[PDB]
Design a binder for this molecule. Sequence first.
Ligand SMILES: Cc1cc2nc3c(=O)[nH]c(=O)nc-3n(C[C@H](O)[C@H](O)[C@H](O)COP(=O)(O)OP(=O)(O)OC[C@H]3O[C@@H](n4cnc5c(N)ncnc54)[C@H](O)[C@@H]3O)c2cc1C
Length: 499
Amino acid sequence: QSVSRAAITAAYRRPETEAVSMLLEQARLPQPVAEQAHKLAYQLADKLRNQKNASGRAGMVQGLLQEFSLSSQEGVALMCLAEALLRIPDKATRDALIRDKILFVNAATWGLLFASLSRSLNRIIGKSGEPLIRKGVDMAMRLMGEQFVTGETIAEALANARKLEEKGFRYSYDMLGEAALTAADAQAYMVSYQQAIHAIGKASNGRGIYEGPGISIKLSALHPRYSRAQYDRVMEELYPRLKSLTLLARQYDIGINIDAEESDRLEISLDLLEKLCFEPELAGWNGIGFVIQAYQKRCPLVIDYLIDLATRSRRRLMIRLVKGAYWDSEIKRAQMDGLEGYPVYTRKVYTDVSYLACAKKLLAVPNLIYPQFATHNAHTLAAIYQLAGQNYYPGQYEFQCLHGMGEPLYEQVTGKVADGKLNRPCRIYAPVGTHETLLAYLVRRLLENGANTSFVNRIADTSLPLDELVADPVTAVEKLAQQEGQTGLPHPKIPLPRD
Ligand SMILES: Cc1cc2nc3c(=O)[nH]c(=O)nc-3n(C[C@H](O)[C@H](O)[C@H](O)COP(=O)(O)OP(=O)(O)OC[C@H]3O[C@@H](n4cnc5c(N)ncnc54)[C@H](O)[C@@H]3O)c2cc1C
């Protein structure tokens, strides 16, 4: 192994105290930068929460819960009466009714401002059995999944691109589908990716890899049973498909991004990337993209490897820095394999520290890397905005977000400074497909949106103060260290697998 590759292997399951301790000073924002990041993060998060005046309205609500000393159920019933009184057309009639004589239809709506289904479920299940549950799972998947899908076909998705592209957004299209089980499956995914590249490239129409749309692909879609595939067959069979797609993307001058999947496939994806970057037909072209996951202990070591690879292959790599989408499965997998540790962090704040440390490493080498900072977290965004320094230029970096999740944050970000935006570009990850391809992606979105550790979940909790929401992760880690006795202890509820 090379020096940078050997270091990656050594860090695979590095103990968490050691890994967090090493990243802390690399992630620490200088005090004036930290202060600017805090103010911007607070600002962004405030406008998020309080679009349509969510907090101010809630404030006026609780204020009247005090003056009259009433309960929540008491307040709602009062509003229903108040609403019915305001529907009396003439004020003299309304006042005379209040003075002399002294319904809940919209009580549910007012309640938003302030059991027997188990019987129906037990009854329905026993009668209809597994085929019923199977349809309900399919129906729920489609209904919850619609918000995350941009179109059923690439033509439909592309036809919708102008609205946000004219506001300064960019796109990366993903033909949904992954973990091909059979040779036919992987062949179908290959054809779907090829069709998409032709369509995206014609829409791009020469706009290039920065301003114009690109495509995102999953290696597991291009090789049957990728999860256990051996190096020899991957190089013989997957790599020609990856090369073919990348050459076609180059002909249209669109970016082609290799998504990151489960941690035990990191090594083989680096081998594929290494071979790809030295193809003569890709010489002098900078459209190859690659995702790295900051929740992995190997991430900073992968960056050192990628920096060396960009130098040796004489290109600028497009690198999407993410936290990671597979955390729940990674924990379970490691616990089942009984190894020495985890390949991912076990406290969410450590992943945040890793992301900031990695972001600094990426921003330091603008000749070698175009960083693409994927996040829906207002603090993460504000930190990167300050860490990138004075004198932004469009080709320095971009943000990225998922369709159906990013819009309210990035509406403050992409666009003109005169319109109150930050004037930084954001590329929207745009899934494309029908219900038959949606399941795995939707499940990962449910885990992301439903976790009480997720920014998108915490910002919707109006009982959590803004300052806690955008708290600096390095300071959070030091506070834990002072309380617990050392830096970087694992999550108390996630012991090592051999325990
Ligand atoms: C445009 C885009 C493309 C992406 N592409 C990929 C990809 O190819 N591969 C991939 O794996 N991910 C990818 N992601 C990331 C993933 O889908 C989530 O969107 C992302 O991790 C959420 O981070 P956030 O900063 O928006 O949220 P935050 O809420 O600040 O962070 C949430 C993340 O913290 C991590 N986490 C949660 N709990 C713990 C814990 N107890 N210990 C340690 N870490 C924890 C998880 O990574 C979780 O997603 C992409 C994201 C975007 C926006």
